[PDB]
Amino acid sequence: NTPVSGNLKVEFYNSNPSDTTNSINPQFKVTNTGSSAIDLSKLTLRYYYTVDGQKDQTFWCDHAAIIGSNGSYNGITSNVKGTFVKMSSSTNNADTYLEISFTGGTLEPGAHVQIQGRFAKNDWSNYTQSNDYSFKSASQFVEWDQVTAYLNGVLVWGKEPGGSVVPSTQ
Numbered sequence: 001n002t003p004v005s006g007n008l009k010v011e012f013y014n015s016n017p018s019d020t021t022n023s024i025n026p027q028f029k030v031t032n033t034g035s036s037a038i039d040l041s042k043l044t045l046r047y048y049y050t051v052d053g054q055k056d057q058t059f060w061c062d063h064a065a066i067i068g069s070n071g072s073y074n075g076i077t078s079n080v081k082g083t084f085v086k087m088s089s090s091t092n093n094a095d096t097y098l099e100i101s102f103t104g105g106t107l108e109p110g111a112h113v114q115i116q117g118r119f120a121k122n123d124w125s126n127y128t129q130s131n132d133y134s135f136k137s138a139s140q141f142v143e144w145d146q147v148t149a150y151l152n153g154v155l156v157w158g159k160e161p162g163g164s165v166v167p168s169t170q
Protein backbone atom coordinates (compact mmCIF):
# COMPACT_ATOMS: atom_id res chain seq x y z
CA ASN A 1 0.00 0.00 0.00
CA THR A 2 2.90 2.37 0.81
CA PRO A 3 4.96 4.12 -1.94
CA VAL A 4 8.73 3.82 -2.17
CA SER A 5 11.37 5.81 -3.94
CA GLY A 6 13.00 2.69 -5.40
CA ASN A 7 16.58 3.37 -4.24
CA LEU A 8 16.27 1.31 -1.07
CA LYS A 9 14.62 -1.88 -0.05
CA VAL A 10 14.16 -2.09 3.72
CA GLU A 11 13.62 -5.42 5.38
CA PHE A 12 13.13 -5.76 9.08
CA TYR A 13 12.13 -7.83 12.05
CA ASN A 14 12.06 -7.81 15.86
CA SER A 15 13.85 -10.88 17.21
CA ASN A 16 12.16 -10.75 20.66
CA PRO A 17 8.41 -11.45 20.34
CA SER A 18 7.20 -11.09 23.96
CA ASP A 19 4.57 -8.48 24.54
CA THR A 20 6.01 -7.57 27.95
CA THR A 21 9.74 -7.19 27.79
CA ASN A 22 12.57 -4.98 28.95
CA SER A 23 14.59 -4.92 25.71
CA ILE A 24 13.37 -4.25 22.20
CA ASN A 25 15.47 -5.87 19.46
CA PRO A 26 15.04 -4.25 16.04
CA GLN A 27 16.99 -5.82 13.16
CA PHE A 28 17.37 -3.96 9.82
CA LYS A 29 18.60 -5.10 6.40
CA VAL A 30 18.75 -2.27 3.86
CA THR A 31 19.56 -3.05 0.22
CA ASN A 32 20.66 -0.52 -2.36
CA THR A 33 18.23 -1.21 -5.23
CA GLY A 34 19.54 1.63 -7.38
CA SER A 35 22.55 1.60 -9.71
CA SER A 36 24.45 4.37 -7.99
CA ALA A 37 26.23 4.07 -4.66
CA ILE A 38 24.91 5.46 -1.41
CA ASP A 39 26.99 7.25 1.23
CA LEU A 40 25.82 5.65 4.48
CA SER A 41 26.50 8.79 6.48
CA LYS A 42 23.43 10.22 4.72
CA LEU A 43 21.13 7.33 5.64
CA THR A 44 18.89 7.31 8.72
CA LEU A 45 16.37 4.74 9.90
CA ARG A 46 13.55 5.18 12.42
CA TYR A 47 11.81 2.67 14.65
CA TYR A 48 8.58 4.18 16.10
CA TYR A 49 7.17 2.98 19.43
CA THR A 50 5.51 4.00 22.70
CA VAL A 51 7.97 4.28 25.59
CA ASP A 52 5.35 3.20 28.19
CA GLY A 53 6.45 5.35 31.12
CA GLN A 54 9.03 7.93 30.13
CA LYS A 55 12.53 6.99 31.34
CA ASP A 56 15.94 7.58 29.78
CA GLN A 57 17.01 4.85 27.38
CA THR A 58 20.09 3.27 25.83
CA PHE A 59 20.70 1.87 22.34
CA TRP A 60 23.36 -0.70 21.51
CA CYS A 61 24.37 -1.74 18.02
CA ASP A 62 25.39 -5.33 18.71
CA HIS A 63 26.59 -5.83 15.16
CA ALA A 64 26.47 -4.16 11.80
CA ALA A 65 28.09 -4.99 8.49
CA ILE A 66 28.00 -3.99 4.84
CA ILE A 67 27.76 -6.98 2.55
CA GLY A 68 28.50 -6.62 -1.19
CA SER A 69 26.36 -8.09 -3.99
CA ASN A 70 29.08 -10.70 -4.50
CA GLY A 71 29.89 -11.37 -0.83
CA SER A 72 32.56 -8.89 0.37
CA TYR A 73 32.32 -8.19 4.12
CA ASN A 74 32.91 -4.94 5.99
CA GLY A 75 32.20 -4.72 9.72
CA ILE A 76 30.89 -1.32 10.73
CA THR A 77 29.46 -1.93 14.16
CA SER A 78 31.32 1.07 15.68
CA ASN A 79 30.04 3.42 12.92
CA VAL A 80 26.39 2.96 14.01
CA LYS A 81 24.75 5.51 16.31
CA GLY A 82 21.32 5.66 17.86
CA THR A 83 19.38 8.68 19.10
CA PHE A 84 16.04 8.63 20.94
CA VAL A 85 13.60 11.39 19.94
CA LYS A 86 10.36 12.29 21.70
CA MET A 87 7.91 13.10 18.93
CA SER A 88 6.53 16.64 18.75
CA SER A 89 3.23 15.10 17.63
CA SER A 90 2.64 11.59 18.93
CA THR A 91 0.10 9.14 17.44
CA ASN A 92 -1.63 6.26 19.27
CA ASN A 93 1.22 3.78 18.78
CA ALA A 94 4.15 6.19 18.55
CA ASP A 95 5.39 8.82 20.98
CA THR A 96 9.11 8.15 20.44
CA TYR A 97 11.47 7.00 17.77
CA LEU A 98 14.88 5.42 17.77
CA GLU A 99 16.80 7.02 14.95
CA ILE A 100 19.77 5.12 13.55
CA SER A 101 22.58 6.93 11.77
CA PHE A 102 26.03 6.10 10.45
CA THR A 103 29.35 7.91 10.62
CA GLY A 104 30.61 6.46 7.37
CA GLY A 105 30.69 3.59 4.89
CA THR A 106 29.54 3.13 1.30
CA LEU A 107 26.62 1.04 0.08
CA GLU A 108 27.28 -0.03 -3.50
CA PRO A 109 24.46 -1.03 -5.87
CA GLY A 110 23.13 -4.40 -4.81
CA ALA A 111 24.99 -4.31 -1.50
CA HIS A 112 23.17 -4.47 1.80
CA VAL A 113 23.81 -3.24 5.28
CA GLN A 114 22.59 -5.28 8.20
CA ILE A 115 22.10 -3.62 11.59
CA GLN A 116 21.34 -5.67 14.65
CA GLY A 117 20.11 -3.44 17.45
CA ARG A 118 18.92 -3.50 21.03
CA PHE A 119 17.51 -0.85 23.36
CA ALA A 120 16.29 -0.68 26.96
CA LYS A 121 15.17 1.77 29.58
CA ASN A 122 18.13 2.49 31.86
CA ASP A 123 16.42 0.88 34.90
CA TRP A 124 15.53 -2.26 32.87
CA SER A 125 11.81 -1.78 33.45
CA ASN A 126 9.31 -3.27 31.01
CA TYR A 127 8.02 -2.11 27.68
CA THR A 128 4.83 -3.30 26.03
CA GLN A 129 5.43 -4.13 22.36
CA SER A 130 1.77 -4.48 21.22
CA ASN A 131 1.29 -0.66 21.14
CA ASP A 132 4.42 -0.02 19.06
CA TYR A 133 3.90 1.19 15.50
CA SER A 134 7.09 -0.32 14.01
CA PHE A 135 7.01 -3.69 15.86
CA LYS A 136 7.07 -6.71 13.48
CA SER A 137 7.62 -10.27 14.70
CA ALA A 138 9.05 -12.66 12.05
CA SER A 139 11.61 -15.42 11.72
CA GLN A 140 13.72 -13.61 9.09
CA PHE A 141 13.98 -10.08 7.68
CA VAL A 142 10.80 -9.24 5.79
CA GLU A 143 9.76 -6.17 3.80
CA TRP A 144 8.14 -3.78 6.26
CA ASP A 145 6.68 -0.35 5.57
CA GLN A 146 6.23 0.70 9.22
CA VAL A 147 9.87 1.54 9.72
CA THR A 148 11.13 4.48 7.68
CA ALA A 149 14.40 5.29 5.93
CA TYR A 150 15.70 8.68 4.83
CA LEU A 151 18.52 9.82 2.58
CA ASN A 152 19.77 13.22 3.64
CA GLY A 153 16.47 13.66 5.51
CA VAL A 154 14.25 12.82 2.52
CA LEU A 155 11.85 9.94 3.18
CA VAL A 156 12.49 7.14 0.61
CA TRP A 157 10.86 4.11 2.30
CA GLY A 158 7.96 3.49 4.63
CA LYS A 159 5.10 5.43 6.13
CA GLU A 160 5.54 7.61 9.24
CA PRO A 161 2.84 7.06 11.92
CA GLY A 162 1.67 10.63 11.33
CA GLY A 163 0.95 9.67 7.71
CA SER A 164 3.88 11.15 5.74
CA VAL A 165 4.95 9.16 2.68
CA VAL A 166 7.65 9.59 0.00
CA PRO A 167 7.50 13.19 -1.46
CA SER A 168 5.23 13.56 -4.56
CA THR A 169 3.41 10.29 -3.76
CA GLN A 170 0.13 9.12 -2.20
Ligand SMILES: [Ca+2]
Nearest residue numbers: 050052128131
Ligand atom coordinates in the same frame (compact mmCIF):
# COMPACT_ATOMS: atom_id res chain seq x y z
CA1 LIG B 1 5.16 0.43 23.93
Ligand SMILES: [Cl-]
Nearest residue numbers: 051052053054
Ligand atom coordinates in the same frame (compact mmCIF):
# COMPACT_ATOMS: atom_id res chain seq x y z
CL1 LIG C 1 4.28 7.64 28.98
Ligand SMILES: [Cl-]
Nearest residue numbers: 143144145146
Ligand atom coordinates in the same frame (compact mmCIF):
# COMPACT_ATOMS: atom_id res chain seq x y z
CL1 LIG D 1 4.75 -4.16 4.77
Ligand SMILES: [Cl-]
Nearest residue numbers: 085088153160
Ligand atom coordinates in the same frame (compact mmCIF):
# COMPACT_ATOMS: atom_id res chain seq x y z
CL1 LIG E 1 11.16 14.89 11.48
